[PDB]
Write a structure and sequence with these properties.
part of a larger assembly; 3 chains; A: alpha+beta; four-stranded mixed β-sheet; 10 helices; 4 strands; 46% helix; B: alpha+beta; 29% helix; RNA-binding; Rib_uL2_dom2 (chain C); structural constituent of ribosome (chain C)
Chain lengths: 221, 119, 249
Amino acid sequence: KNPLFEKRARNFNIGQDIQPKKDVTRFVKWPKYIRLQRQSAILQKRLKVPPTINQFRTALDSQSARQAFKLLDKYRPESTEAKKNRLRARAEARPNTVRHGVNTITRLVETRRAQLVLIAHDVNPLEIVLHLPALCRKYNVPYAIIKGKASLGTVVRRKTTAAVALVDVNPEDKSALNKLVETVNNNFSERHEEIRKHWGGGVMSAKSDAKKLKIERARAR
Amino acid sequence: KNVRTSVHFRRPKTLVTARAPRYARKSAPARDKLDSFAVIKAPHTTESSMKKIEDHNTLVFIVDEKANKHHIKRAVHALYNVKAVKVNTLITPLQQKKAYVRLASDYDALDVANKIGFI
Amino acid sequence: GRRIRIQRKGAGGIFKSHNKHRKGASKLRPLDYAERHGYIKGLVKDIIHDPGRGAPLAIIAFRDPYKYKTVKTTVVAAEGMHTGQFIHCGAKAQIQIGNIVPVGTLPEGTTICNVENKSGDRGVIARASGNYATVIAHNPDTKKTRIRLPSGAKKVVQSVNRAMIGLVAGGGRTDKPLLKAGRSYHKYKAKRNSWPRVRGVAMNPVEHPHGGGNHQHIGHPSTVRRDASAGKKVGLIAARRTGRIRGGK
RNA sequence: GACUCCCUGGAAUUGGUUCAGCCAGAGAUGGGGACGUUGUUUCCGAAAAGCACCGCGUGGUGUCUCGUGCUCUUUGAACGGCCCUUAAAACACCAAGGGAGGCUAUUAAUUUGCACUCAAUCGUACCGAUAUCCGCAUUAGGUCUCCAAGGUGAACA
RNA sequence: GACAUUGUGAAGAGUCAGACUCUUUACUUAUUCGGUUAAAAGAGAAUUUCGAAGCAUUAAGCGGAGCCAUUAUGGCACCGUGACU
């Protein structure tokens, strides 16, 4: 062991060796758009949310959402490669598919032709789909608020889509659709009594909760 | 979440691409109008200019107002095949550029003036 | 009539402060981790004279905790501060002249200067030469302190407000008469255009409410109400009383 | 080359010292040294110049030794008095701390000195005032500065 | 002064028949003011002063895994910790 390899530790206490490069992410002065994003999210959490708006916060759980997407991917619209291959064949010479678009889905629901409806949980503006849950519940159409308008658009070969509907399904996936309907109804349709009453928001910050708890303990003592 | 050791947020560096225009704005480049003929306008043939030519090996020219000493040197060389060791320039009260060109010792200003015509 | 001198002062033209040779603003260090959880040592490198200010300024050098660099601070010196002295700033600094500490840690009757009106404003109170505030009382339950200002007022501040221990240097300045008018001329030459002062009664009625008349007299009560208009608010503004003060006040 | 700085040594019976200050056991006097802007020269530039004189139809001779000062102007040095007055900012260059790095004892990195090329554009004449400006003008008016001989005298009267 | 911006809770009184009105008080997300080069905020976890005019920068140490050239010797290069969640 070389005697010259001597450890020389650094004291980072106040008035001592200069501070090292630590983590200061929470103190970064973020640009204006980032600040607005974060503050908007905080404000949405803090303010009390009326039930008809809060109903979109509680979406399908991970497992049920995975099952729904597994079923949905079986009827994706015609691809670009498929269209290219079909075009020249047709020049030389409509199965079941997922429907999309709020107007199309609304017409299907009002005509009671849709068997399952999936509504994106993050449609902005929210007034675009604010009526679909109530309309589906009124017409007795199974409906679920699912996470990801981008995910639905991917299912539909698009960027985003507000809502999708499964008008007709093959006998192979009839059982899958039935199970999906039961799972969707268990958590969305029958609980309409609680959904109409539940008020969201009102969550304070961790700092405020800590201060309130300290005050409560002090008063109890 | 991208650990940051600095409290300052700088704009991220992004790729910048050079222009690859789909057509030339100008069909053809403009031709340089300040050639030797434009640079050298006419010799100065006053008594003072003659004295300069005879006594100092210095030619006197009236030149374009947009020509600098480098332009005058190059134009004189290309027009009379004579080197210039120094070029002095002034602008007369009538806004005319007058240039005194001292030729190298090899050349004779009197002979060059004789050849040009002003003498 | 025309606008009066008081009205004209607001446009900030010839009435701006003369600050060509000022040495900077007197300010405590920005509140930070060192001052909040300990103390930081700075060296009093200089004591200098600031034009337009009767109190000397202290140039103090501190070491930057987060980079290889020194930071210089300008603040009005407390009497007794000298070059080469060490000034400790923070919550754990001891009671010594020149130290900058929260007012909550000082005993009653302590004399302070550069008091922080609000936590983090870097010292705003008791900054004229020879002036000081006093720590009257504490309230740990609400974490507050009552202090006495130089004017005799009593004000409540947060216990974390910082102040410098001691009084401001240069006291006793306003005891020597400015015997000559040129002395006042030079005095205000370094501060602003507020001198000489022409009496209103000596003016014409077009420039002053007091102007005019075959005799130099005000003609109307000099006590004007608080809400008077801009061109009329001249004299004793909202005066609760007038005349020589007989007794304490 | 005043001022400042260094070494030796240890001062009362106190000394050194300025026109005036002031300085010393926190190291005086004495003795010996270091530094440096202003500047000077029996030196180069350079007498082949300029000046004065004598001749000829382009020549020659000399241009040298000293002094002096409450003298003025300018520059420089060192201090003192004054302020409730304390007497710019940028650029640029230099220095120091640091030691990341770089070349590898007849190699190399690297400085040093010479030789070489270039340094663009615009102003440049003249008046600047009892006649070149402003005042109707070649108007007793007005309009910012630098250089400053002898006598008498305190003196740019 | 009223209305709107104006939100979320408590206590008292008064009106009614679960609501309204007031008065006091609490919260923070609207709003406002201040500090800073937005630099150590809140919870939890371990458990520098005899007031000396000096310097403090381009990580040592520890542990873990790699590469290159001829087991080893050379040279060159990461991650964690040091710097608590």
